[PDB]
Design a protein around this ligand. Structure first.
Ligand SMILES: O=C1CC=C(OC(F)F)C=N1
Ligand SMILES: [Zn+2]
Length: 140
C-alpha cells in the first residue's frame, strides 16, 4: 500500500483505489495502474521533473529502502500477478529488486522528488508507475 500526496491530489495504484477515491476521481488510467483523487488537505510530496534513472524505493515486504537504477518509462509486458492478468503496462520503469503485491504504492524518489510508485514485481524485478510526465499534478 501507499500513495503520493501532492497539492490536493492523492495518487494511488488504480488496483488499490478505494470507493472514496472513485467517488472523488480526478483521473485514472488502467494501462498505467494509476488513479488520482481529490483531497481536502494539502500533501507533503514534491513530484520529480527530470529523466533520472537512479533513485531509492521503499520495499514494505523488507521494511527497507533500496537504492536502484531503473529503466526509462516504457510499454512493458508484465506477467500475471495477484491483482492483474498478464498484460502490457505503459509508463513503467523496471529495476532489479524485491517486490511483492503488497509493496505496491511504495515511493521511488530521486534528488528531484517523487518519481513514481511500486506497481509490479516478480522474477527479481520491481516495476514503478512513473508520474513525472503528469505535470498537471503541480497546479490547479
Ligand atoms: O492472474 C490473474 C488474472 C486476473 C487478475 O485480475 C483480477 F482478477 F484481479 C489477477 N490475476
Ligand atoms: Zn530526478
Amino acid at each position: 500500500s501507499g500513495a503520493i500526496y501532492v497539492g490536493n491530489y492523492r495518487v494511488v495504484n488504480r488496483h488499490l483505489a478505494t470507493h472514496n477515491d472513485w467517488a472523488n476521481l480526478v483521473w485514472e488510467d488502467s494501462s498505467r495502474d494509476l488513479l488520482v483523487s481529490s483531497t481536502t488537505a494539502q500533501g507533503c510530496d514534491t513530484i520529480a521533473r527530470c529523466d533520472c534513472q537512479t533513485g531509492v524505493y521503499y520495499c514494505s515486504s523488507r521494511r527497507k529502502h533500496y537504492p536502484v537504477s531503473f529503466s526509462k518509462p516504457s510499454l512493458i509486458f508484465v506477467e500475471a500477478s495477484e491483482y492483474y492478468p498478464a498484460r502490457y503496462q505503459s509508463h513503467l520503469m523496471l529495476a532489479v529488486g524485491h517486490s511483492e503485491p503488497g509493496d505496491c504504492g511504495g515511493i521511488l524518489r530521486c534528488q528531484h522528488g517523487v518519481v513514481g510508485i511500486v506497481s509490479t514485481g516478480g522474477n527479481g524485478l520491481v516495476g514503478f508507475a512513473d508520474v513525472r510526465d503528469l505535470l498537471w499534478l503541480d497546479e490547479e
